Amino acid sequence: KFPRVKNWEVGSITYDTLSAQAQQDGPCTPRRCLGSLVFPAPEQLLSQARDFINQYYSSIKRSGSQAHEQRLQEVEAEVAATGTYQLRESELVFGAKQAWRNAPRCVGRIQWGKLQVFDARDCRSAQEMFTYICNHIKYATNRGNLRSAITVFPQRCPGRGDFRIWNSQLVRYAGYRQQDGSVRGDPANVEITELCIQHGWTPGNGRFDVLPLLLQAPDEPPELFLLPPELVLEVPLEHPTLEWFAALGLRWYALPAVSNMLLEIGGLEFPAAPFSGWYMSTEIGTRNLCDPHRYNILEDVAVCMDLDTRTTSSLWKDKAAVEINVAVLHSYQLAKVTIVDHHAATASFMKHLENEQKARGGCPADWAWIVPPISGSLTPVFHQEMVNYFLSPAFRYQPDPW
Amino acid sequence: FPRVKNWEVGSITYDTLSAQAQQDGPCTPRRCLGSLVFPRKLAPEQLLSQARDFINQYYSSIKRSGSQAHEQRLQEVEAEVAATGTYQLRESELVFGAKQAWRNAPRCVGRIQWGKLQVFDARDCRSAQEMFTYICNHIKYATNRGNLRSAITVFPQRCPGRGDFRIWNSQLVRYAGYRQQDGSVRGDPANVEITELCIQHGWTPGNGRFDVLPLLLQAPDEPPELFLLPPELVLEVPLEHPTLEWFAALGLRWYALPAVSNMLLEIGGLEFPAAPFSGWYMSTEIGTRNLCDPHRYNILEDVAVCMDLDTRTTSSLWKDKAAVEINVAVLHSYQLAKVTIVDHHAATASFMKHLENEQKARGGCPADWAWIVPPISGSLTPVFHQEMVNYFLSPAFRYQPDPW
Ligand code: HEM
Ligand code: HEM
Ligand SMILES: Cc1cc(N)nc2cc(-c3ccc(OCc4cccnc4)c(CN)c3)ccc12
Ligand SMILES: Cc1cc(N)nc2cc(-c3ccc(OCc4cccnc4)c(CN)c3)ccc12
Ligand SMILES: C[C@H](O)[C@H](O)[C@H]1CNc2nc(N)[nH]c(=O)c2N1
Ligand SMILES: C[C@H](O)[C@H](O)[C@H]1CNc2nc(N)[nH]c(=O)c2N1
Ligand SMILES: [Cl-]
Ligand SMILES: [Cl-]
Ligand SMILES: [Gd]
Ligand SMILES: [Zn+2]
């Protein structure tokens, strides 16, 4: 009674037995599927903790041992005396990697074992928090040879408020409301842009103004910190054979660092644990630049290309979008900044699936997010059936602190 | 009542119609199986309850719920099943059920058209030659010299005991798939099987990679018999490119009529194992999936070499550039041949409008996001940013086992 999962390109068949271990419940029922929705104490802290400790001791091939039973006993003793417990350094590293390994919407998981874990659980103030973040950005950027990383700030604990990064990513561009009712810059960042200004940021008026950080230490208001210009590696966009493209003045940044998600490990919660990888080119070309509710450049590019935008059957949108993606891949390669195209990325994710099937007997994967937003069926993940479910450790969404 | 958001515009709606969904799907709170193509697998007390449900909505759809023959029609079906074990549908019920089954198909992006459907009633057919003639009137009517019209032909319902009418081909028009001393296929690899069944039932094979297969039609109980399609009934389109002069020399073609002939129409508890339906193509079905899938004609590499694309590195997006032009050549060729076709932008835009109508009419719409979003340029179309609820309503088209 485990789901049978077929690849329709090749004919292979597997069964996802890992799904029967799904340590939480999602939004679907036998009556209706909600798979496409974007947003779907001591004794229970104890069972989450015991399950994680069991996982950790499996991964080091030491399950059911003395050191294993001791650690379980230590944990339930700590939860008795304090209502919580502290992870050892090696458990934190393993926990952070599993949460990446368990993220069902991430197509980059072939890399999950190569993660640099920075332990900032001794962090003390917003100012120290800024220092750790700058170090993260600089290590992860690495002059364009990007490295995956996560920095873990102190956990949620009773008595004190949370560390929070108010920005959804460490690097985002401002979005300024206009007189047209329109938006200058990134429309997805209007809210954080207004928050910054009302916390004392002098706004610019460009389309690619990098936003300051809003950092919150426990029981403190958020504090504003400017990122040093030379810390934020950016890439001017040009096209290899459409020379007018460089005159659009488009740019994107090197480092995708998500900073507003909650990291859950063995019952414990880290509301501030930003992590970074490297971009897949369609994130920039298709979503960030062509979405009508983002920079929405697609029709402007198509007009410049002398495509017939009068009629949809010329496929002018598909043509413009492929060329924007080409420009993205060419610009990053030219600037020597790590980037992966959706063909290579999905191919390596197929290898991840085969790796995971041998290791854990399955892989949580969200088909609608794994399949790229252009050229879906040209990639191998399109013809691969998938089973979505929630494993822990996990990265979870959390409400905005404001 | 599930909250459903459109992320492109910000609108929010509630799918109250999902509450009235019955036949359970494959998902559970612990794991989602929405991406699976065939979910799970494939005392006449049950027949009455389904029969009375179907009758009730029929009379709600014509206002007349409340006294009148509405009261009356519930009785005849009661009596008919009490006497015979099955029942027969009144002709307007069969039309209404056929339309609703289409309206309820969660994977269909063309449902804006659900009201305009021609229903050919072939329930009095009792022969294989009769089926064949019924099929040909359909193909002729549906094709209509290239001005395609949606049509379904309903053959007699399955009766308890004694066999089924059935069409063996998955579609009325399919291209041959021939193996060889390479293990590879010439023709359509998706139809390797039904060609095997075509030859072993007495068919003479063909030349190359665009040979229209014969129909394997099966009257109840006695084995299927071959039927050869008249060429002038099979409108095909040869594929050319508006500016790439060499594309035509590649020798590709596709047929005009997508007519599905292996699904089971279920109305009011009755099951019709032979009810072939047809509409018209979205161009990505031909360009992207039929011609470009690695397990189909797989032409993508050949078109890239002719375009002089850099096939040495994935990062040139040569696959994406070649695929767009194939689609452009499909749209162009069908327009030149005055054959009805629709691009994935127009189709998805119409489907958004269908979603809004259905919100007003029934308070929701079953939609399978992974099949509604086109296989190319997905996020460039409005359905991409539209959350959708998938569930089973009746009347419905279902998949069914193959007859071997
Ligand atoms: C190294 C290269 C990486 C690539 C190419 C990559 C790629 C992606 C992509 C394309 C998405 C979907 C986003 C979208 O389409 O809107 C995603 C989601 C996600 N990624 Fe990865 N990623 C990488 C590294 C990482 C790392 C290092 C982490 C954390 C340790 C991570 C965690 C996640 C999570 C949690 C999600 C889901 C976020 C959500 O559900 O909203 N990724 N990734
Ligand atoms: C009139 C123009 C029509 C268009 C453009 C259209 C388009 C489509 C497309 C693109 C699919 C997805 C198939 C795939 O890519 O695998 C589909 C599926 C389907 N269509 Fe439509 N179709 C049309 C008419 C019809 C009609 C007339 C009927 C029935 C009377 C119908 C019933 C279905 C069903 C039952 C499915 C599969 C649903 C499922 O598997 O749950 N369609 N259609
Ligand atoms: C480490 C990493 C590397 C990479 N290369 N890529 C990444 C993309 C995301 C990502 C996560 C959630 C997202 O979405 C959240 C959201 C909020 C509101 C509405 N829709 C969606 C999006 C963009 N969709 C991207 C997260 C991490 C990424
Ligand atoms: C009336 C109509 C019009 C149109 N314009 N288009 C249509 C496409 C399909 C259709 C239904 C099921 C399908 O899938 C069957 C299948 C078999 C094996 C593996 N997976 C899936 C496919 C192709 N995917 C197309 C059905 C009807 C269509
Ligand atoms: C409504 C829709 O399901 C939603 O906007 C999803 C669809 N699939 C996606 N897939 C990826 N990779 N990224 C996304 O942001 C989305 N958005
Ligand atoms: C594995 C995957 O779910 C499967 O290949 C589906 C995905 N979506 C699809 N969507 C359409 N329209 N047609 C298809 O054949 C498929 N294939
Ligand atoms: Cl981004
Ligand atoms: Cl087809
Ligand atoms: Gd040029
Ligand atoms: Zn589901």
C-alpha–C-alpha distance, residues B397 and B102, integer Å: 7
Rg (CA), chain B: 23
C-alpha–C-alpha distance, residues A101 and A395, integer Å: 10
The answer to whether the CB of A71 falls within 8 A of the CB of A65 is no
The shortest CB-CB distance from A287 to any of B15, B293, B379 is to B379
The answer to whether the CB of B118 falls within 8 A of the CB of B152 is yes
* Residues in contact with B254: Cβ distance below 8 Å, sequence separation at least 6, in sequence order: B236, B237, B239, B286, B290, B291, B330
Helix (H, G, I), strand (E, B) or coil at B47: helix
Site of tokens 């990446």: A100
A contacts of B380 (beta carbons < 8 Å): 286, 290, 298, 317-318, 321, 373-374
C-alpha–C-alpha distance, residues B14 and B5, integer Å: 9
The CA-CA-CA angle for residues B72, B77, B82, to 5°, reads 125
For β-strands B3-5 and B396-398, DSSP reports them as unpaired
Q: What's the gap in Å between B349 CA and the centre of ligand 2?
A: 16
Is residue A287 less than 8 Å (CB to CB) from chain B? yes
A contacts of B37 (beta carbons < 8 Å): 6, 8, 385
The answer to whether the CB of B120 falls within 8 A of the CB of B154 is yes
Q: What's the gap in Å between A386 CA and the centre of ligand 1?
A: 17
Interface subset of B 12-41, CB within 8 angstroms of A: 15, 18, 21, 24-37
- Cβ neighbours, 10 Å, residue B44: 13
Q: What's the gap in Å between B188 CA and the centre of ligand 8?
A: 11
Q: Find which of B7, B13, B293, B315 to mutate to test the A interface (most A CBs within 10 Å of its CB).
A: B315
Site of tokens 């880290």: A270
* A6 CA closest ligand 6 atom index: 1
B contacts of A375 (beta carbons < 8 Å): 317, 319-320, 323, 376-377
C-alpha–C-alpha distance, residues B34 and B31, integer Å: 9
Query: Crossing angle for the helix pair A42-59 and A89-101, nearest 10 degrees?
Result: 90
Cβ separation B317–A333 shorter than 8 A: no
Is residue B352 less than 8 Å (CB to CB) from chain A? no
At A174, list the tokens: 């401002």
Buried b (16+ CB within 10 A) or exposed e, B83-108: eeebbebeeebbbbbbbbbbbbbbeb
**Is residue A109 flagged as an active site residue?**
yes
- Cβ neighbours, 10 Å, residue B403: 16
> What strand order describes the sheet that includes B264-267?
B270-272, B264-267, B396-398
Residue B117's Cα: distance from chain center in Å?
Answer: 13
The residue to mutate among A39, A102, A106, A284, having the most atoms of ligand 3 within 8 angstroms of its beta carbon, is A106
Q: Helices H, strands E: what count in chain A?
A: 11, 16
* Strand locations in A153-300 (E): 164-165, 175-177, 183-185, 213-216, 223-225, 234-236, 251-253, 257-258, 262-265, 268-270, 275-276
* Residues in contact with A13: Cβ distance below 8 Å, sequence separation at least 6, in sequence order: A4, A5, A6, A7
Q: Mind listing the domains of chain B with CATH numbers?
A: 15-123+150-160+264-278+348-372 (3.90.340.10), 124-149+164-235+399-403 (3.90.440.10), 236-258+281-346 (3.90.1230.10)
* A385 CA closest ligand 6 atom index: 1
**Is residue B45 flagged as an active site residue?**
no
Helix (H, G, I), strand (E, B) or coil at B322: helix
Enter the resolution in angstroms.
2.2
A contacts of B377 (beta carbons < 8 Å): 315, 317-318, 321, 374-375
Ligand 2 environment, Cβ below 6 A: B 102, 105-110, 113, 117, 150, 152, 277, 279-280, 282, 285, 342, 347, 371, 397
The answer to whether the CB of B16 falls within 8 A of the CB of B364 is yes
Helix (H, G, I), strand (E, B) or coil at A263: strand
Is residue B391 less than 8 Å (CB to CB) from chain A? yes
